[PDB]
């Protein structure tokens, strides 16, 4: 994609299109830190379910 940086010049007003751009940039900074130790894309830290609704067939989670 195209990910942009804002510039906080004085006399440059306010747009909510700005804050979305900056906040979706340190997320990209988190990968370049992390991609010095990775082969292949990521997975599951934890996942827990509630199996009581299995005879009434339904499936729902507790912690994810």
């Amino acid at each position: 994609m195209k990910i942009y940086r804002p510039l906080w010049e004085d006399g440059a007003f306010l747009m909510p299109q700005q804050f979305q751009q900056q906040a979706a940039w340190d997320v990209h900074l988190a990968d370049s830190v992390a991609r010095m130790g990775l082969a292949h894309p990521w997975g599951v830290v934890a996942a827990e379910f509630d199996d009581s609704l299995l005879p009434l067939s339904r499936l729902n989670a507790t912690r994810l």
Binding site: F13, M15, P16
Partner: protein, 350 residues
């Protein structure tokens, strides 16, 4: 015009026994001012004017009282009051002319139409001196930057031709002209410029202030072996120049004018009144304001978020009553640059 008696004498036939002639001719040009029968166009084209039936009365100023206007003869003035109005008349008619009117008799009733051709074209301009051509006091002229008594009475400030680059024409002559006649002055005129434009607002000036940067392009604190200097230039890396950047505060108490000083309202009034009229390239002016808390919303789209540089007026969900604060900044009234370039030629060897 047909509308000239159809407005005046058909409707307002209630003060004509005691009307002034000075008042009467004024209301004619105020009856149809949109493209009027201009009184200055008398010099070739009195045909097709349909002016008022003053002439032939022989009356002095403010003594026209009779009121008869025809409609069939396609020109309303055909008036001759007999035995009255001999204004400047000394001797009777010549010999050959009486032999053509025959004989100063009832035929003279159809002779004063030609005979008073001279007095018609003179009592136009007789009036025009008293009301437009040498009197008007810049009050009976009453123009909108056309009437010549303005332009004669405003070139003593030095604004012919300099209406360029201004969104308004020269309108603030009414109070600034006494102040704009003293040379090189002053600071106290900026108080008048604010109290004129929006009452309820006061002004204070601080003459010097701590200005900052201009960053000097050689750092110059290299300590030099071949050649250096001392006497004045001693500093660190950024300089400070006080000398010319005055601070101005405003103080309002009516909330309808609070939303006038934020950019869009009355800020375009000061920003053009300074830069080309009263100061020009003398100085630079800093603006500031102090109100109670604000009336300011937030992050909505394209253009009106910013209350200058700061933001507030959105968070107090706690307490009922007032706290005083400074408001914001506004920009300087400056105009500068460098253009780009280097040069190629020189002056003269004398």
């Amino acid at each position: 015009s047909q509308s000239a008696p159809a407005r005046l004498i058909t409707r307002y036939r209630k003060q004509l026994p005691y009307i002034n002639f000075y008042r009467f001719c004024q209301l004619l040009e105020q009856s149809q001012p949109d493209q009027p029968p201009i009184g200055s166009g008398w010099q070739a084209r009195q045909e097709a004017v349909r002016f008022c039936p003053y002439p032939g009365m022989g009356f002095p100023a403010s003594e026209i009282k009779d009121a008869v206007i025809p409609e069939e003869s396609h020109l309303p003035p055909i008036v001759h009051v007999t035995f009255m109005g001999l204004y400047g008349v000394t001797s009777p008619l010549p010999a050959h002319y009486i032999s053509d009117i025959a004989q100063q008799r009832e035929g003279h009733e159809a002779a004063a139409d030609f005979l008073d051709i001279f007095s018609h074209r003179l009592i136009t301009q007789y009036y025009r001196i008293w009301r437009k051509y040498s009197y008007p006091a810049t009050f009976e002229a009453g123009g909108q930057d056309k009437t010549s008594q303005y332009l004669l009475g405003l070139a003593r400030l030095g604004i012919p031709g300099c209406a360029q680059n201004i969104a308004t024409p020269v309108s603030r002559f009414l109070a600034l002209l006494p102040l704009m006649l003293l040379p090189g002055r002053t600071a106290e005129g900026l108080t008048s410029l604010v109290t004129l434009l929006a009452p309820g607002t006061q002004a204070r000036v601080w003459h010097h202030d701590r200005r900052r940067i201009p960053l000097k392009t050689p750092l110059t604190m290299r300590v030099h072996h071949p050649v250096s200097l001392k006497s004045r230039p001693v500093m660190g890396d950024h300089a400070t120049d006080v000398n010319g950047q005055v601070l101005l505060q405003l103080s309002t108490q009516t909330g309808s004018e609070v939303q006038g000083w934020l950019p869009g309202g009355h800020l375009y009034s000061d920003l053009l009144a300074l830069l080309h009229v009263y100061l020009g390239s003398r100085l630079d002016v800093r603006l500031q304001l102090c109100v109670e808390r604000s009336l300011l919303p937030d992050a909505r789209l394209s253009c009106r978020p910013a209350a200058g540089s700061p933001q507030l007026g959105r968070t107090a969900v706690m307490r009922t009553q007032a706290k005083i604060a400074t408001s914001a900044a506004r920009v300087m009234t400056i105009s500068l640059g460098r253009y780009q370039r280097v040069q190629e030629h020189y002056q003269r060897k004398e």
